[PDB]
């Protein structure tokens, strides 16, 4: 319909915690082909984060039940079959986001900030695919995630301040990729530690608009470092 109505519907759905509605609204906004404002960008990201996050959380639970029912084959087969059903929904949602990124979001990004944001997003949704990838497809999926994160990383290093929350957020999620997907603690820790120290050395470049997001991500970066050591 009309874009302003769709955005207002999306904001209502968010308050109601109806994230399927919220994602449907923001996907329609995106498909109209015009570059998203920062507010629209955030709404789209929040909606799909919640939609895919529901399945990722169910997947972790069912996958853990599957492991705990080793030696009880009837129950374990049922947990495996339910996990594979959740995985199909998970892939469908990720394919949805990734297609929006390819056709509309990344080609339209006219600022380094938007470029980094959407490349990070591409890295994220390929990473969620990698979490549940198995066969010949996994290495290519992993490589797509790495290339997206790498492109964002280079742009952000050249164009954004160390304290910028999108630069910090990218370092956070890229380090998680290195640890959880590439199985490389040292590259995860090196990335998270460097992002933290560069930011902590430049605190007076924090703006009132963003210091809460930035200092939060810094804490998360050091949390991951602590855990990984």
């Amino acid at each position: 319909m009309d874009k302003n109505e769709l955005v207002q519907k999306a904001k209502l759905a968010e308050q109601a915690e109806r994230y399927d509605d919220m994602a449907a609204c923001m996907k329609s906004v995106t498909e109209q082909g015009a570059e998203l404002s920062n507010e629209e960008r955030n709404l789209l990201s929040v909606a799909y984060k919640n939609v895919v996050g529901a399945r990722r959380s169910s997947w972790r639970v069912v996958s853990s039940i599957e492991q705990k029912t080793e030696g009880a084959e009837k129950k374990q087969q049922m947990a495996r079959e339910y996990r594979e059903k959740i995985e199909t929904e998970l892939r469908d949602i990720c394919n949805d986001v990734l297609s929006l990124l390819e056709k509309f979001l990344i080609p339209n990004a006219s600022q380094a900030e938007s470029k980094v944001f959407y490349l990070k997003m591409k890295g994220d949704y390929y990473r969620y695919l990698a979490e549940v990838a198995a066969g010949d497809d996994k290495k290519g999926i992993v490589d797509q995630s790495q290339q997206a994160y790498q492109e964002a990383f280079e742009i952000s290093k050249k164009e954004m301040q160390p304290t910028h929350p999108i630069r910090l957020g990218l370092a956070l999620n890229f380090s998680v990729f290195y640890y959880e997907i590439l199985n490389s603690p040292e590259k995860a820790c090196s990335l998270a530690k460097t992002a933290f120290d560069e930011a902590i050395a430049e605190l007076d470049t924090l703006s009132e608009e963003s210091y809460k997001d930035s200092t939060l991500i810094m804490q998360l970066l050091r949390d991951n470092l602590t855990l990984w050591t």
């Binding site: 956070l172 999620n173 998680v176 640890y179 959880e180 998360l220 949390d223 991951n224 855990l227 990984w228």
Partner: peptide, 4 residues
């Protein structure tokens, strides 16, 4: 481990 934390992601954004």
């Amino acid at each position: 481990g934390h992601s954004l």
